[PDB]
C-alpha cells in the first residue's frame, strides 16, 4: 500500500523535476519557454533515464502516468501534463501556451513558482512517506 504509493508519487515528482529543469534552462539563457507543441515532448524515455528502445520504458511508472492522462495523444506537451488528469497533484488550469522572458516581473519566473508551488505538496508527501521507512 505505502510502498506502491511512493513509487507513483516519485514518478510524478520526476516529471515535475524534468519540467523545472526546462524552465531553469530558459531562465539561465534569458529565454521564454513554450509549453505547447513547440516545447518539449514529455513522452521521451531519455528524460527519465531510459535508453531509446529499452522495453523497460513502457513498463515504467513514468510511462504509466503520462500515457493515461486525458491530454495524452501518443505525445505530451508540458501544458498537457500540468493540466492533465489523473494525477495526484490535480490539474493546473488556464495556463498560457508560452511564457516570454521579461526584465520586469518575468513571466518565466512566475511560471516557475506556479509549478514549484504545485509540486511542493507532492514532494512533502514523498519525503514523509520515505521518512517512515529506513
Amino acid at each position: 500500500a505505502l510502498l506502491d504509493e511512493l513509487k507513483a508519487l516519485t514518478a510524478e515528482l520526476k516529471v515535475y523535476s524534468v519540467i523545472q529543469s526546462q524552465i531553469n534552462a530558459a531562465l539561465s539563457a534569458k529565454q521564454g519557454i513554450r509549453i505547447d507543441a513547440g516545447g518539449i515532448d514529455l513522452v521521451d524515455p531519455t528524460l527519465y533515464g531510459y535508453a531509446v528502445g529499452d522495453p523497460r520504458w513502457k513498463d515504467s511508472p513514468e510511462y504509466a502516468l503520462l500515457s493515461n492522462l486525458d491530454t495524452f495523444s501518443g505525445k505530451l506537451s508540458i501544458k498537457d501534463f500540468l493540466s492533465g488528469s489523473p494525477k495526484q497533484s490535480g490539474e493546473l488550469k488556464g495556463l498560457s501556451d508560452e511564457y516570454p522572458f521579461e526584465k520586469d516581473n518575468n513571466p518565466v519566473g512566475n511560471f516557475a513558482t506556479t509549478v514549484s508551488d504545485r509540486s511542493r505538496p507532492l514532494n512533502d508527501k514523498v519525503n514523509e512517506k520515505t521518512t517512515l521507512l529506513n
Epitope: R34, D36, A37, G38, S67, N68, L69, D70, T71, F72, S73, G74, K75, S77, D80, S83, G84, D97
Partner: antibody, heavy 120, light 107 residues
Framework: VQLVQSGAEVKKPGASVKVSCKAS????????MHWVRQAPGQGLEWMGE????????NYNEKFNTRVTMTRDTSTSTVYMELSSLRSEDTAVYYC??????????????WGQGTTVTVSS | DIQLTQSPSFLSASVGDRVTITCSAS?????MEWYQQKPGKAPKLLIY???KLASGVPSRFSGSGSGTEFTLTISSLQPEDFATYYC?????????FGQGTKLEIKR
C-alpha cells in the same frame, strides 16, 4: 475555428496529389494537425499528423512511404501530399484538429473535406 | 495497432427508444471518443475522454466504459439521431476507428 481545404481533384494512377488546409481561429503552432480519409461506402482511417511549430511528422505505417505533410506557419496552412496514387486512394481527405485540443476547448474541428478520385 | 470492433454493426430502433452501442478494443486503452456521421458530411464529435459531452451535444448522449469495453448510449432517440456512429482512439499509434454502427428506423 475554421479549417478550409482545397477543391476536389482527379488524378491518374502513379501521379501524386497535394491538398491544402488553411487554419484559423486558434494558435496554429500550438497543436498537431491530423489527416483522416474515407473511401466511398467505407469507414475512417487516420493517415498521420504534423506539428506545425517544427515540421515534425508521424505517419500511419500504411502511408509512411507515400505521404508527405508540410506546413507554412506564415499562412497557417498545412499540406498533405500523397504520391504513387492508386484507385484505392479514391477518398475524401480531411484535415482535423483534435486530441488534446478537445480537452482544453470541449470540441474538435474538421475541414470540409477534399474528394480525390484516382482512375485511368 | 488497436482494433476497435463495434457491436452491433447495424441497429434498428424507434424514435423514443433508449439504445446502447458498444466498442470493444483489442487491448486496453485509456479513453474512447465517439463520432456521429451523416451522408455527405464530416464526422461530428459527440463524446470525448470516454464520457464528456462535446460543446452543444444534447444531454441525450452519454458515454461510459473502461479497459477494452466502451459504450455510447442515447436515451430517447430523436429523428436526427439516425446516423452512423464511430468510436475512435487517439492514444496509441496508429490512431484507429471502429468499423461503424449504422442506426435505422423501425417500420
Amino acid at each position: 475555428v475554421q479549417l478550409v481545404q482545397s477543391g476536389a481533384e482527379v488524378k491518374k494512377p502513379g501521379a501524386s496529389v497535394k491538398v491544402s488546409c488553411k487554419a484559423s481561429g486558434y494558435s496554429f503552432t500550438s497543436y498537431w494537425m491530423h489527416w483522416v480519409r474515407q473511401a466511398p461506402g467505407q469507414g475512417l482511417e487516420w493517415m498521420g499528423e504534423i506539428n506545425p511549430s517544427n515540421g515534425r511528422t508521424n505517419y500511419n505505417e500504411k502511408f509512411n512511404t507515400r505521404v508527405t505533410m508540410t506546413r507554412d506557419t506564415s499562412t497557417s496552412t498545412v499540406y498533405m501530399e500523397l504520391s504513387s496514387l492508386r484507385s484505392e486512394d479514391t477518398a475524401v481527405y480531411y484535415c482535423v484538429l483534435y486530441g488534446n485540443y478537445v480537452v482544453y476547448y470541449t470540441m474538435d474541428y474538421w475541414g470540409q473535406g477534399t474528394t480525390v478520385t484516382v482512375s485511368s | 495497432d488497436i482494433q476497435l470492433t463495434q457491436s452491433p454493426s447495424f441497429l434498428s430502433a424507434s424514435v423514443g427508444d433508449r439504445v446502447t452501442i458498444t466498442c470493444s478494443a483489442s487491448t486496453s486503452v485509456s479513453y474512447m471518443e465517439w463520432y456521429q456521421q451523416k451522408p455527405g458530411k464530416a464526422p461530428k464529435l459527440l463524446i470525448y475522454t470516454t464520457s464528456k459531452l462535446a460543446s452543444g451535444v444534447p444531454s441525450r448522449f452519454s458515454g461510459s466504459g473502461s479497459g477494452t469495453e466502451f459504450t455510447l448510449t442515447i436515451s430517447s432517440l430523436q429523428p436526427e439521431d439516425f446516423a452512423t456512429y464511430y468510436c475512435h482512439q487517439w492514444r496509441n499509434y496508429p490512431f484507429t476507428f471502429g468499423q461503424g454502427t449504422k442506426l435505422e428506423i423501425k417500420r
